[PDB]
Design a binder for this molecule. Structure first.
Ligand SMILES: *[C@@H]1O[C@H](CO[C@@H]2O[C@@H](C)[C@@H](O)[C@@H](O)[C@@H]2O)[C@@H](O[C@@H]2O[C@H](CO)[C@@H](O[C@@H]3O[C@H](CO[C@H]4O[C@H](CO)[C@@H](O)[C@H](O)[C@@H]4O)[C@@H](O)[C@H](O[C@H]4O[C@H](CO)[C@@H](O)[C@H](O)[C@@H]4O)[C@@H]3O)[C@H](O)[C@H]2NC(C)=O)[C@H](O)[C@H]1NC(C)=O
Ligand SMILES: *[C@@H]1O[C@H](CO[C@@H]2O[C@@H](C)[C@@H](O)[C@@H](O)[C@@H]2O)[C@@H](O[C@@H]2O[C@H](CO)[C@@H](O[C@@H]3O[C@H](CO)[C@@H](O)[C@H](O[C@H]4O[C@H](CO)[C@@H](O)[C@H](O)[C@@H]4O)[C@@H]3O)[C@H](O)[C@H]2NC(C)=O)[C@H](O)[C@H]1NC(C)=O
Ligand SMILES: CCCCCCCC/C=C\CCCCCCCC(=O)OC[C@H](COP(=O)(O)OCC[N+](C)(C)C)OC(=O)CCCCCCC/C=C\CCCCCCCC
Ligand SMILES: CCCCCCCC/C=C\CCCCCCCC(=O)OC[C@H](COP(=O)(O)OCC[N+](C)(C)C)OC(=O)CCCCCCC/C=C\CCCCCCCC
Ligand SMILES: CCCCCCCC/C=C\CCCCCCCC(=O)OC[C@H](COP(=O)(O)OCC[N+](C)(C)C)OC(=O)CCCCCCC/C=C\CCCCCCCC
Ligand SMILES: CCCCCCCC/C=C\CCCCCCCC(=O)OC[C@H](COP(=O)(O)OCC[N+](C)(C)C)OC(=O)CCCCCCC/C=C\CCCCCCCC
Ligand SMILES: CCCCCCCC/C=C\CCCCCCCC(=O)OC[C@H](COP(=O)(O)OCC[N+](C)(C)C)OC(=O)CCCCCCC/C=C\CCCCCCCC
Ligand SMILES: CCCCCCCC/C=C\CCCCCCCC(=O)OC[C@H](COP(=O)(O)OCC[N+](C)(C)C)OC(=O)CCCCCCC/C=C\CCCCCCCC
Ligand SMILES: CCCCCCCC/C=C\CCCCCCCC(=O)OC[C@H](COP(=O)(O)OCC[N+](C)(C)C)OC(=O)CCCCCCC/C=C\CCCCCCCC
Ligand SMILES: *[C@@H]1O[C@H](CO)[C@@H](O[C@@H]2O[C@H](CO)[C@@H](O)[C@H](O)[C@H]2NC(C)=O)[C@H](O)[C@H]1NC(C)=O
Ligand SMILES: CC(C)CCC[C@@H](C)[C@H]1CC[C@H]2[C@@H]3CC=C4C[C@@H](O)CC[C@]4(C)[C@H]3CC[C@]12C
Ligand SMILES: CC(C)CCC[C@@H](C)[C@H]1CC[C@H]2[C@@H]3CC=C4C[C@@H](O)CC[C@]4(C)[C@H]3CC[C@]12C
Ligand SMILES: CC(C)CCC[C@@H](C)[C@H]1CC[C@H]2[C@@H]3CC=C4C[C@@H](O)CC[C@]4(C)[C@H]3CC[C@]12C
Ligand SMILES: [Mg+2]
Ligand SMILES: [Mg+2]
Ligand code: NA
Lengths: 40, 993, 294
């Protein structure tokens, strides 16, 4: 480390948003499944 | 429109003569009026047509939905928001637009709610308009000595009008000459049987005399003449309709509950505002700022989504009713049924079927019962004896009625039959259990028939015998049991014949009194085989001299008949009585029939007795017995006319099974008012016009759809398109279910209040950075929260709802202090603490420890301080610290959702446990899933920190509200436990909503 | 109603309950809220046990340092009359507040101040971010270094005759090493001359192309006479490990300023670990609206 300790000030917000969206989508799907499970 | 002169009982000039009548109105008894005079009167007073109802433009019922009690509160909230924005604009530079957004949002919410409610009431109005079928009608008037058929709108007072069996009485006539003319006074007077109209006068009451024809009545059989006495709106039913239209509407119960709810919400809102106003003035702030603080706290204490949630909730309960054929015109009339505690019903057309049907039959010294139910769902009467066959032949032959052409599609009971009611019932019974009567009649040709005389009181006829081995002649007569009994000497027992000894004569007398006491009309059928040796096949029996033996006939059996009740009438009455609903019969029919129908449907439980019954069982006068020992009472209309208010109050206060007979429509209204005077909700169920003044003044009116009148249908609040009475039970059940659900949903939308306000209060008192932004409060109150609150309506019952007593209106409210103590006091507090926890965590991880946050708002807000030292010594620019504050708003909103999970689960049930009821509500599960997906979407979607100002969260923050949620679940679980084990304890009178 | 629900004399009730009831409810709420407070406090103590006293766990919201100045402008505008003295008082008061912390009397002795190179130098590492060694030592920064804007000669600092000064300062960040652009063929025009590697350059200019002519001679004052910040004053070890720490400063005199006209001057620092933002107008650069109306 030392002078080139640039990583100590970086965060991968991109990957975080990608995962959070994948999860949100999955939860939404599951919800729909449960809602329509019975009318078919 | 004098209402008192319309509230009085109808008067008339019936007690007069034909000369006095012609001398008062002016009219020739044999020539009628002249065309010139007829037109002079037509233009002098107006056409014989009822006035149309008061129309209503569509923009009026839209402005109505935009107002009320809840929408008005949201309106004042929007007004306050714009006022605070104006003050901030004229007092400070760079005014934030938060208030303008909140105000336009509130206005949009009110507009959308109004559009939805209006669309629903319009849907109901369209399906209601598709029922008014008005075909023009023309009457037969005699002018200048000639008969002419002119439109009903051209009939005037004084001309001569002739009627014929099958036509409708145009105006109010005064019969001058009739020929066996019967009339159907069921709609106006409620008389189930056809009363004969005679030119002579008989009773002091105009509704009882036979010399007066009434508007909208139809002549069943016969022809008659008459002078038009009353025309146009001045007719009887005209004054009744005008009175119905000239009545107020009232104010249902759900509205009163919403009003008291708003009263509490505003009490606590203005209290917190005036208090933090004096407090802010005590801490140094200026007036200009304190005013904005007052308006902000008042607005913050207003539920924007409770309006849409309540409206959609009620609409959801309305669609089920529409699925079972129960249509409501308004939207709040769906709950009134559940709160009802006294149902006033009608007999003719509502409790009964208004159709004569063969009830009991006598044959082989044994009483037999026949099925008298619409759908024919009952027990047969043992159609295996020869006696029944002979009876069927007598009834099917000695009968002149025949089904109306073109009825091959309708059922055997609902088809039209041209003839008397008795003959129609006999024909229907024979066609029901004996096959096609047309073939039974063509199988035996009728040779000679002697009509029904008023003196002979018997109808006889001779026909050929279809026996291929016997060419003799058959004679069949029918009539009054006494007259027929005096003309017989044999009895057809099990097929064989036997003498008429006094044993069977006494059994016949007992059978006659048995069928008579049942309120039925009994007839006697007998026949005889004429000896072909004394009357050959060629001899013609002209009806002139005694060609047939009047006596020595063979009596086969009696046949009773009466109007039966609808299929689900007894079961529905029993279900209503089980739920603690007092059933009181109110009808303008004969008391001898009203009492029988009451005992047959459950109004007068078997075993109870009236004062007359006791006096008859003891053989003592009626003035000696005490009226307190009689549970059921039959109040006659004539006696009701001379009764004070206190007497009526005592009648309803001491008698549990009351039956009002021979009561006029005005008296019906008086009864409804006497019931309301105490404090109970009233539901009136009717079908005719006589029920119009009763359906309007009652808290809720139920009109029949097929057998109901247009006036009563337009003046009622609920319509039974299928004429099923069990719908009343279904309605009283749904009215309760959606009530406990409204309570749950209200507590749900009120629990979030605290974690939405507390941040601003701590912001002003403690001077800490703003915790909950405005677009987050909006994303919570109008977003996520909507689906769960709507789902709370689909909750099933916990205990039997059709078992508990009706809710008391003066003590058990919809929103009491027990709810406020939970939402505002215990759950909301925990949710607010969880939000503040996530807040402090976010600020502590970035460098601002809790000790350095108290006292920073002055510099944390300042837009020109680009060097704010944190707990570690770092220098933060303005936009950098603002980004952190926004991320704290995002995490606060997510914490709110996390605690709402456990709040929706503890709100699902009010007393029972979750491991008992069960999570069978799929809508609630979908609500939780969607509630979480929306929060994740609002935070992780790109471009949100620009549009809505919500930054992404780090996976470790999302878990800061979990312990608070589980704690809320455990606390409410143990709460809903002591209530069960300890009924009536502290936890019940303190936390049981 | 109104009177009864307030005080009845048969059941001896007040507001609805008797004497013993209000007590039962008050006691219940007191115990409930007490437990609530104790639980919240415990959950906050575990949080205090989760953080370190010598370093912020997350340092991503403060990666690109800001560029602030000494005068306190309401809308980033400096407008004052050269005649009325009660016009530039708000400026001098601030300026003075900032420079009042670099007084020599404050910087005295060996502890905790240490004499550093009078000419720009390289970084200096006083170990790790621990408490093993006692309070670290920070370099001394003398007032006099700033020549015509020091309040030692002309207290007003310039505002008295139409020659205001502007003391620029770099936002203090823990463990942040400033890195300047290298001598390669790609470098702005301005930066070529006087490439002292050890100095972070600061250079002001005009926002619009027109204003160039109306702006006169930007005279910068700093450590060694250069227009930048010496790398030797870094890094910053944080308040706890370096109390009594002074950050470098750079004075800027806007000599020859056109009279009676609003001039938009944008100052900007150059460097590798320095990045600007179109949303935050104080990240690395700064804007000032000077108008010496007289
Ligand atoms: C950091 O240094 C500041 C300046 O230090 C001075 O110069 C350095 C190089 C050394 O020589 C040091 O010894 C000097 O003091 C220091 O601020 C100074 O503090 C003194 C003490 O209060 C101030 O003296 C007072 O001046 C006023 C009038 O001030 C006028 O000028 C200033 C600008 O300089 C304006 O801001 C004012 O509004 C006025 O226009 C006198 O009225 C006052 O009278 C008092 O003393 C006399 C005897 O002399 C008595 O008879 C009276 O009753 C009063 O008791 C003082 O003479 C001096 O103005 C001030 N300088 C500045 C520029 O403000 C600062 O405090 C130091 N800070 C730290 C943390 O070390
Ligand atoms: C940072 O960089 C500059 C420029 O470096 C030059 O460009 C770079 C992009 C890269 O290509 C380098 O390799 C390249 O050198 C440095 O400053 C330069 O220094 C030289 C040497 O002094 C100067 O060249 C001089 O040009 C004069 C006229 O303009 C000429 O008269 C000079 O004569 C000198 O050299 C001749 C031999 O060529 C000798 O005979 C003479 O007696 C006399 O010594 C000389 O050629 C450049 O002009 C300089 N550039 C600028 C912009 O001033 C700079 O020193 C460096 N800094 C550090 C700290 O490394
Ligand atoms: C009955 C009701 C059922 C309901 C089911 C709902 C479905 C749930 C759906 C999804 C949940 C799984 C999520 C998994 C996601 C992992 C993705 C991942 O890669 O994530 C890594 C992060 C670490 O982030 P960092 O900051 O360290 O690095 C950041 C580094 N950068 C930023 C530089 C890149 O980690 C994380 O997000 C941690 C993710 C959270 C961990 C899951 C914890 C589960 C909790 C309780 C369940 C226990 C069940 C027990 C079984 C009982 C059976 C009877
Ligand atoms: C019946 C069955 C139904 C099934 C339906 C399934 C639907 C599909 C399900 C999931 C789809 C997943 C799509 C994933 C998209 C990833 C996009 C992404 O990762 O973009 C990230 C970057 C922005 O990063 P940055 O550097 O600006 O960060 C800020 C850095 N700072 C602030 C520090 C400077 O993107 C960019 O640049 C370019 C972005 C371009 C726009 C992409 C649009 C994505 C928006 C919405 C799609 C997600 C919907 C998911 C469903 C949810 C339902 C509620
Ligand atoms: C920065 C700090 C943050 C601060 C945040 C504050 C958030 C505010 C949270 C909650 C607001 C509380 C406001 C008061 C709510 C009271 C509820 C209420 O008014 O509901 C209305 C009920 C009516 O109910 P009903 O329809 O069933 O009646 C039927 C009667 N029938 C049937 C006999 C006719 O009326 C009643 O309950 C009667 C009225 C009783 C009023 C009690 C007033 C107590 C208020 C403060 C006490 C403080 C004392 C502290 C010192 C303690 C000693 C150490
Ligand atoms: C540290 C973290 C703290 C978090 C705190 C918040 C927690 C809130 C979230 C979830 C709480 C779950 C509670 C579990 C309760 C289970 C109760 C249960 O199992 O009671 C069994 C019932 C009773 O049956 P019975 O005897 O009446 O049947 C009679 C059948 N006959 C009539 C045919 C005989 O059976 C039934 O209800 C039928 C089967 C129903 C199965 C339900 C399974 C779904 C459960 C939860 C959904 C997950 C939501 C997740 C939300 C997160 C979104 C991202
Ligand atoms: C059963 C039925 C199922 C139906 C499910 C439907 C789910 C729909 C799922 C996804 C669609 C969501 C909308 C997609 C939005 C795409 C926006 C986008 O791709 O933006 C990309 C660019 C960002 O570019 P950059 O990184 O270079 O910017 C740098 C800016 N610097 C550097 C100055 C900071 O955007 C920009 O520039 C400008 C950003 C414009 C903001 C648009 C966001 C809209 C705001 C509120 C609407 C959300 C309401 C919630 C509805 C919930 C429905 C369930
Ligand atoms: C069924 C489930 C539904 C779920 C949906 C969730 C419900 C949401 C409920 C309420 C949220 C609506 C609040 C509207 C907020 C508008 C904010 C706004 O106008 O801010 C104005 C900003 C200006 O900002 P600045 O001064 O910092 O600019 C400085 C620029 N400098 C410095 C560079 C010059 O301009 C901008 O952001 C420009 C971009 C404009 C973005 C407009 C986004 C509108 C979002 C929603 C409206 C539609 C919602 C309808 C759905 C209803 C659901 C029932
Ligand atoms: C972060 C958020 C944390 C939140 C944690 C909250 C924990 C605090 C929970 C409970 C503390 C309150 C205890 C108050 C005890 C004093 C109350 C009292 O003075 O009461 C007196 C009565 C006895 O009078 P009586 O009825 O015989 O007189 C008849 C009189 N007449 C006619 C009016 C009915 O007492 C009774 O009835 C007995 C009723 C006692 C109340 C039981 C309530 C238990 C509720 C929750 C405990 C579960 C905590 C689970 C947490 C798990 C954490 C992981
Ligand atoms: C400062 O600006 C002034 C202009 O305001 C410059 O002086 C002018 O120079 C022109 C010739 O180019 C003369 O015509 C004017 O009469 C001069 N005006 C004054 C007021 O002297 C001056 O050269 C500038 N000085 C610096 C150091 O930039
Ligand atoms: C029924 C109960 C117990 C289920 C509780 C599920 C909870 C723990 C789930 C639901 C949604 C989940 C979060 C959804 C979104 C994100 C963002 C993603 O980038 C990392 C995972 C993370 C941070 C998840 C952590 C776990 C989480 C909060
Ligand atoms: C932020 C903090 C300090 C505010 C604390 C406010 C507490 C003390 C307030 C909030 C809500 C209040 C309760 C709300 C409802 C009721 C029911 C009523 O019939 C009697 C008063 C009673 C029981 C209140 C007592 C005081 C109470 C619990
Ligand atoms: C189950 C519930 C009721 C238990 C609540 C326990 C509460 C009262 C306990 C839990 C943790 C405790 C705190 C933990 C840490 C500190 C810091 C210490 O330097 C002084 C004591 C102090 C300030 C404690 C005070 C009491 C406290 C808040
Ligand atoms: Mg009727
Ligand atoms: Mg709200
Ligand atoms: Na009504």
């Amino acid at each position: 480390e030392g002078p080139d300790n640039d990583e100590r000030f970086t965060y991968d917000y991109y990957r975080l948003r990608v995962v959070g969206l994948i999860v949100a989508a999955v939860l939404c799907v599951i919800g729909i499944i449960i809602l329509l499970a019975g009318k078919c | 429109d004098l209402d008192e002169l319309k509230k009085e009982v109808s008067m008339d000039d019936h007690k007069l003569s034909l000369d006095e009548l012609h001398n008062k109105y002016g009219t020739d008894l044999t020539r009628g009026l002249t065309n010139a005079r007829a037109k002079e009167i037509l233009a002098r007073d107006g056409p014989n047509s009822l006035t149309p109802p008061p129309t209503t433009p569509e923009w009026i019922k839209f402005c109505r939905q935009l107002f009320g009690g809840f929408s008005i509160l949201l309106w004042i909230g929007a007004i306050l928001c714009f006022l605070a924005y104006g003050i901030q604009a004229a007092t400070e530079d760079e005014p934030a637009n938060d208030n303008l957004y909140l105000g336009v949002v509130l206005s949009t919410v009110v507009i959308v709610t109004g559009c939805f409610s209006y669309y629903q009431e319009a849907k109901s109005s369209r399906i209601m308009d598709s029922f008014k079928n008005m075909v023009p009608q023309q009457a037969l008037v005699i002018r200048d000595g000639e008969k002419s058929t002119i439109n009903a709108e051209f009939v005037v007072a004084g001309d001569l009008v002739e009627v014929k069996g099958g036509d409708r009485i145009p105006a109010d006539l005064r019969i001058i000459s009739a020929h066996g003319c019967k009339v159907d006074n069921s709609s106006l007077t409620g008389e189930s049987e056809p009363q004969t109209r005679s030119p002579e006068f008989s009773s002091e009451n105009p509704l009882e005399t036979r010399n007066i024809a009434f508007f909208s009545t139809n002549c069943v059989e016969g022809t008659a003449r008459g002078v038009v006495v009353y025309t146009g709106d001045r007719t009887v039913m005209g004054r009744i309709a005008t009175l119905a239209s000239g009545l107020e509407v009232g104010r249902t119960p759900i509205a009163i509950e919403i009003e008291h709810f708003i009263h509490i919400i505003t009490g606590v809102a203005v209290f917190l505002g005036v208090s933090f106003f004096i407090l802010s003035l005590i801490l140094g702030y200026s007036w200009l700022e304190a005013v904005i603080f007052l308006i902000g706290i008042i607005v913050a204490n207003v539920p924007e989504g409770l309006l849409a949630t309540v409206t959609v909730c009620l609409t959801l309960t309305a669609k089920r009713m529409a699925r079972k054929n129960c249509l409501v015109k308004n939207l709040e009339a769906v709950e009134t049924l559940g709160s009802t505690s006294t149902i006033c019903s009608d007999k003719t057309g509502t409790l009964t079927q208004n159709r004569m049907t063969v009830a009991h039959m006598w044959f082989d010294n044994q009483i037999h019962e026949a099925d008298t139910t619409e759908n024919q769902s009952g027990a047969a009467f043992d159609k295996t004896s020869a006696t029944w066959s002979a009876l069927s032949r007598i009834a099917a032959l000695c009968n002149r009625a025949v089904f109306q052409a073109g009825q091959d599609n309708v059922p055997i009971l609902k088809r039209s039959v041209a003839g008397d009611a008795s003959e129609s019932a006999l024909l229907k019974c024979i066609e029901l259990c004996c096959g096609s009567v047309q073939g039974m009649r063509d199988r035996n040709p009728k040779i000679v028939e002697i009509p029904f005389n008023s003196t002979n009181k018997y109808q006889l006829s001779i026909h050929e015998n279809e026996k291929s081995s016997e060419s003799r002649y058959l004679l069949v007569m029918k009539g009054a049991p006494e007259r027929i009994l005096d003309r017989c000497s044999t009895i057809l027992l099990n097929g064989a014949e036997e003498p008429l000894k006094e044993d069977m004569k006494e059994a016949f007398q007992n059978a006659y009194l048995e069928l008579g006491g049942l309120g039925e009309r009994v007839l006697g059928f007998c026949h005889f085989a004429l000896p072909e040796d004394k009357y050959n096949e060629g001899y013609p029996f002209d009806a002139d001299e005694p060609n047939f033996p009047t006596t020595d006939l063979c009596f086969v059996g009696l046949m009773a008949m009466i109007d039966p009740p609808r299929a689900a009438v007894p079961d529905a009455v029993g279900k209503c009585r089980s739920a603690g609903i007092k059933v009181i019969m109110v009808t303008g029919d004969h008391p001898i029939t009203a009492k029988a129908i009451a005992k047959g449907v459950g109004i007068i439980s078997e075993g109870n007795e009236t004062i007359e019954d006791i006096a008859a069982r003891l053989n003592i006068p009626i003035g000696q017995v005490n009226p307190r020992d009689a549970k059921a009472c039959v109040v006659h209309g004539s006696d009701l006319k001379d009764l004070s208010t206190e007497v009526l109050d005592d009648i309803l206060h001491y008698h549990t099974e009351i039956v009002f007979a021979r009561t006029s429509p005005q008296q019906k209204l008086i009864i409804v008012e006497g019931c309301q005077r105490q404090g109970a909700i009233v539901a009136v169920t009717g079908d005719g016009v006589n029920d119009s003044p009763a359906l309007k003044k009652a808290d809720i009116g139920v009109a029949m759809g097929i057998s109901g009148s247009d006036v009563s249908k337009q003046a009622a609040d609920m319509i039974l398109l299928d004429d099923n009475f069990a719908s009343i039970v279904t309605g009283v059940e749904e009215g309760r279910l959606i009530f406990d659900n409204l309570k749950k949903s209200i507590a749900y939308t009120l629990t979030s209040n605290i974690p939405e306000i507390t941040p601003f209060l701590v912001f002003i008192i403690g001077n800490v950075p703003l915790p909950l932004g405005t677009v987050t409060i909006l994303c919570i109150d109008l977003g996520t929260d909507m689906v769960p609150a709507i789902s709370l309506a689909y909750e099933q019952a916990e205990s039997d709802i059709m078992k508990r007593q009706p809710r008391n209106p003066k003590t058990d409210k919809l929103v009491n202090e027990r709810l406020i103590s939970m939402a505002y006091g215990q759950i909301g507090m925990i949710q607010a603490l969880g939000g503040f926890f996530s807040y402090f965590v976010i600020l502590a991880e970035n460098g601002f420890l809790p000790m350095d946050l108290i006292g920073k708002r002055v510099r944390w807000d300042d837009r020109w301080i680009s060097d704010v030292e944190d707990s570690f010594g770092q220098q933060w620019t303005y936009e950098q610290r603002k980004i952190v504050e926004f991320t704290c708003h995002t995490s606060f909103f997510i914490s709110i959702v996390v605690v709402q999970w456990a709040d929706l689960i503890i709100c699902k049930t009010r007393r029972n446990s979750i491991f008992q009821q069960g999570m069978k509500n799929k809508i609630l599960i979908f609500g939780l899933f969607e509630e979480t997906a929306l929060a994740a979407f609002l935070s992780y979607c790109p471009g949100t920190d620009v549009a809505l100002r919500m930054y992404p969260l780090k996976p470790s923050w999302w878990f800061c509200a979990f312990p608070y949620s589980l704690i809320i679940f455990l606390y409410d679980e143990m709460r809903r436990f002591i209530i069960r084990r300890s009924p009536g304890g502290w936890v019940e009178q303190e936390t049981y909503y | 109603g109104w009177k009864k629900f307030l005080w009845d004399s048969e059941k001896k009730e007040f507001l609805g309950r008797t004497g013993s009831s209000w007590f039962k409810i008050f006691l219940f709420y007191l115990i409930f809220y007490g437990c609530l407070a104790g639980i919240f406090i415990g959950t906050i103590q575990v949080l205090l046990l989760t953080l370190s006293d010598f370093e912020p766990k997350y340092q991503d919201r403060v990666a690109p340092p800001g560029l602030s100045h000494a005068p306190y402008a309401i809308k980033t505008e400096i407008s004052f009359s050269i005649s009325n003295p009660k016009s530039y008082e708000s400026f001098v008061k601030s300026m003075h507040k900032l420079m009042d912390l670099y007084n020599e009397s404050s910087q005295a002795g060996n502890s905790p101040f240490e004499d550093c190179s009078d000419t720009p130098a390289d970084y200096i590492k006083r170990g790790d971010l621990d408490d093993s060694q006692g309070q670290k030592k920070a370099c001394r920064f003398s007032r006099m270094w700033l020549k015509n804007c020091s309040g030692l000669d002309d207290t007003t600092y310039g505002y008295a005759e139409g020659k205001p000064c502007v003391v620029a300062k770099l936002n203090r960040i823990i463990g942040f090493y400033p890195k300047p652009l290298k001598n390669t063929t790609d470098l702005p025009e301005e930066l070529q001359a006087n490439y002292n590697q050890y100095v972070l350059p600061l250079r002001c200019a005009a926002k619009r192309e027109e204003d160039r002519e109306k702006i006169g001679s930007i005279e910068y004052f700093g450590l060694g006479g250069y227009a930048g910040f010496p790398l030797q004053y870094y890094p910053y070890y944080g308040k706890r490990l370096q109390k009594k720490y002074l950050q470098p400063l750079l004075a800027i005199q806007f000599t020859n300023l056109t009279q009676n006209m609003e001039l938009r001057i944008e100052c900007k620092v150059y460097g590798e670990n320095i990045d600007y933002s179109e949303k935050d107008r104080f990240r690395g650069r700064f804007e000032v609206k000077i108008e010496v109306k007289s």
